[PDB]
Design an enzyme around this catalytic site. Structure first.
Site, PDB file in Angstrom:
ATOM      1  NE  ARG A  60      -3.594  -0.180   0.026  1.00  7.81           N
ATOM      2  CZ  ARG A  60      -4.210   0.034  -1.128  1.00  7.81           C
ATOM      3  NH1 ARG A  60      -4.244  -0.896  -2.075  1.00  7.81           N
ATOM      4  NH2 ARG A  60      -4.794   1.212  -1.340  1.00  7.81           N
ATOM      5  CG  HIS A  97      -3.161  -2.862 -10.002  1.00  7.25           C
ATOM      6  ND1 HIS A  97      -3.432  -2.256  -8.796  1.00  7.25           N
ATOM      7  CD2 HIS A  97      -2.000  -2.335 -10.444  1.00  7.25           C
ATOM      8  CE1 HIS A  97      -2.467  -1.397  -8.516  1.00  7.25           C
ATOM      9  NE2 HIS A  97      -1.583  -1.430  -9.498  1.00  7.25           N
ATOM     10  CB  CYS A 104       1.945  -1.858 -11.979  1.00  8.14           C
ATOM     11  SG  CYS A 104       1.679  -0.982 -13.536  1.00  8.14           S
ATOM     12  CG  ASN A 118     -10.315  -4.369  -7.663  1.00 12.08           C
ATOM     13  OD1 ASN A 118      -9.577  -5.324  -7.882  1.00 12.08           O
ATOM     14  ND2 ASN A 118      -9.869  -3.212  -7.156  1.00 12.08           N
TER      15      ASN A 118
HETATM   16 MG    MG Z   1      -7.646  -6.094  -8.368  1.00 11.38          MG
HETATM   17 ZN    ZN Z   2       0.974  -2.862 -14.661  1.00  4.73          ZN
END
Ligand code: MG
Ligand code: ZN
Ligand code: MG
Ligand code: ZN
Ligand code: ZN
Ligand code: ZN
Lengths: 162, 162
Positions: A60, A97, A104, A118
């Site tokens: 985090r 992500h 990233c 998500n």
């Molecule tokens: Mg995710």
């Molecule tokens: Zn990435």
DNA sequence: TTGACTCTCTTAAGAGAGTCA
DNA sequence: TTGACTCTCTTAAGAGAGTCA
């Protein structure tokens, strides 16, 4: 901060700093037996991380800027979406992500969606294996597959029907 | 320790009791635009629930039996699997609703698998829509679909490539 | 031995905020 | 002002254990 100009300035500063993170090439399953390549812009493993960034948990981070002489702070992946609604159907919007790579910070690998949407990408067959996400996946989810179920549905007597 | 015979007796008393829960007919998506029927054996909304059963949370129950003066207690959906391994690939096994109906205690609607496998069934396209679970889903997951993503991947400048 | 309540915990996808230098 | 740490929280799929009569 409050003004649209101040928010654009935050996003622009974040992009400039993240754009200097190391670019790591990751080869990923797309589904359908195909493979692709993603370019993740990865925050460093240890301090210093970059101007404005600090680690608040094992995976985090937060982005911090001083505006109007006050500190404004955001989750490090939320900054691209500061001008978007922060909820949908009454559910909190989360940074999500598409590359499933928490370090990233490439905004081309992020979307803004409910925590349920998500999570569900973890099991998606991927853009070449049948992904139906309206905002399409960049890869097959890391948990896609047959699973490892230990025991299936069963009864000892005759009390139940499917 | 409870013997194999005693564990079988627990499973049998649990089945006897759950088999008297109200049986509710649900029409469900199977994937591929098909509809099917599931018959759930639903624990009551409020006390009394049935012999041996008690509510420890809004949608959590436990089953309790006293054997040779010792009180034994199990999660209410774990009882069908007391003769199975309790972990796999280093992960705890969990009762997993194939019908996605927490009140249901039909053992023909339960499997025993990691929490990740369990969660992932929420997004499965279903037994007629492309399910690849080795222990096959009984229905399309309630969260399957295009999702409701608020904002997709995007950049304001040119610092990034996908 | 049993029922009907009470409390906190786990996981892995995500968060906010305080303490110092 | 900026950096580098600290802490706990949220969610929705799941858990364990205590008290009292
Ligand atoms: Mg995710
Ligand atoms: Zn990435
Ligand atoms: Mg489940
Ligand atoms: Zn997808
Ligand atoms: Zn059921
Ligand atoms: Zn499935």
């Amino acid at each position: 901060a409050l003004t649209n100009a101040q928010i654009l300035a935050v996003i622009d500063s974040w992009e400039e700093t993240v754009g200097q993170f190391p670019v790591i090439t990751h080869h990923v399953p797309l589904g359908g037996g195909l493979q692709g390549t993603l370019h993740c812009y990865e925050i460093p493993l240890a301090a210093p991380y970059g101007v404005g960034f600090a680690k608040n948990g094992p995976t985090r981070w937060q982005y911090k800027r001083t505006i109007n002489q006050v500190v404004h702070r955001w989750g490090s992946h939320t900054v691209p979406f500061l001008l978007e609604p922060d909820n949908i159907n009454g559910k909190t919007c989360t940074a999500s992500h598409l590359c499933h790579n928490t370090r990233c910070h490439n905004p081309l690998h992020l979307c803004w969606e409910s925590l349920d949407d998500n999570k569900g990408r973890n099991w998606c067959p991927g853009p070449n294996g049948g992904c139906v996400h309206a905002v399409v996946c960049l890869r097959q989810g890391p948990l896609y597959g047959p699973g490892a179920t230990v025991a299936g549905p069963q009864q000892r007597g005759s009390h139940f029907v499917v």
